[PDB]
């Protein structure tokens, strides 16, 4: 419970540093300082009742759904995304403190990018009436998985066991849902070391948007998240691998948001 506070304080000070370096709006800055004060207090509140990884995941999820806020201009939200991306980029320049923290901003940045596009798509399309709230809980599960994957980075057999488990699970899940081709591409991606992490993160994001909008793709999206989280835990052990992880997480966030927009403007009209 005590190690969570150091993670939240360090990551928070890094987004504060990125905010000051970027010449941001003073009101926008201190509003976000209070917004992650909320995540600081919530990190301590949810522990000892929920597990530590679950508390960190919901802290990041509420932090991102917070970072969208209520009435914020598009440039300010883009600037929040820029501050998170730059803070992760500079967190790639370093301890076990750095790797777990950098994943936490990346999970929050990925969560915040997709939530903002879900909410903004309804305003243009006239469908402001709801899917973003579930995505917060789904990414709360996802953020704890990525935290746990980097929590496993101290070992070397837990790494191989988790990697083989997640590769088998992702291939089996896509086979089980009738996607034989995609299952074989996921096997190839998992077979190519870290050289195919960009395409795997693109596919992971697109399936995150599809498992959000339809429950029949949920297990495939979760299994792809497990495989991707293991891979990113392998990447962040080094310096440029942390940088490649930052770029790959950006890839996942952008593709998940693009597929979320495409799915919102396609016939999501049910029937009474």
Which percent bin holds the helix content? over 70%
Shape annotation:
globular
Terminal residue distance: 47 Å
User: How much strand content do the residues show?
Assistant: under 5%
Oligomer: monomer
The ordered H/E elements are HHHHHHHHHHH
Largest sheet: none
Number of strands: 0
- What number of domains? 1
Number of helices: 11
PDB class: de novo protein
Keywords: Chroma, DE novo protein
Assembly: monomeric
Entry title: UNC_239 from Chroma generative model
Question: Key features?
Answer:
81% helix; mainly alpha; de novo protein; 272 residues
Structural description of this entry:
With 272 residues, the chain is mainly alpha-helical. It has eleven helices and no strands. It is globular, with a radius of gyration of 18 Å.
Quick description:
With 272 residues, the chain is mainly α. The chain has 11 helices and no strands.
List the topology elements.
Layout: H1 2-21, H2 26-46, H3 52-67, H4 74-91, H5 96-125, H6 131-151, H7 157-176, H8 180-191, H9 197-213, H10 218-235, H11 239-264
Helix pairs in contact: 1-2, 1-4, 1-5, 2-3, 3-5, 3-6, 4-5, 4-11, 5-6, 5-11, 6-10, 7-8, 7-10, 9-10, 9-11
PDB class: de novo protein
Keywords: Chroma, DE novo protein
Assembly: monomeric
């Amino acid at each position: 419970v005590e190690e969570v506070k150091r993670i939240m304080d360090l990551a928070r000070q890094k987004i504060s540093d990125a905010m000051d370096e970027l010449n941001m709006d003073a009101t926008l800055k201190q509003s976000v300082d209070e917004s992650m004060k909320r995540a600081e207090q919530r990190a301590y509140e949810l522990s000892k009742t929920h597990e530590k990884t679950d508390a960190l995941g919901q802290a990041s999820a509420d932090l991102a759904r917070e970072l969208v806020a209520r009435n914020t201009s598009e440039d300010h939200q883009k600037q929040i995304f820029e501050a998170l991306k730059k803070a992760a980029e500079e967190m790639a320049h370093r301890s076990h403190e750095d790797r777990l923290v950098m994943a936490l901003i990346l999970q929050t940045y990925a969560n915040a990018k997709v939530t903002f596009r879900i909410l903004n798509s309804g305003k243009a399309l006239g469908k402001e009436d709801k899917m973003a709230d579930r995505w917060t809980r789904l990414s709360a599960e996802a953020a704890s998985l990525s935290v746990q994957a980097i929590n496993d980075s101290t070992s070397a057999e837990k790494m191989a066991e988790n990697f083989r488990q997640a590769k088998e699970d992702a291939v089996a899940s896509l086979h089980r849902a009738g996607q034989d081709d995609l299952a074989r591409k996921v096997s190839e991606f998992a077979d190519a070391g870290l050289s195919k992490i960009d395409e795997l993160m693109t596919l992971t994001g697109q399936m995150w948007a599809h498992g959000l909008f339809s429950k029949e793709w949920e297990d495939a999206a979760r299994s792809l998240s497990r495989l991707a989280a293991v891979m990113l835990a392998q990447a962040s052990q080094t310096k440029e691998g942390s940088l490649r992880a930052v770029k790959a997480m950006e890839k996942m966030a952008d593709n998940a948001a693009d597929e979320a927009e495409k799915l919102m403007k396609a016939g999501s009209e049910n029937l009474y």
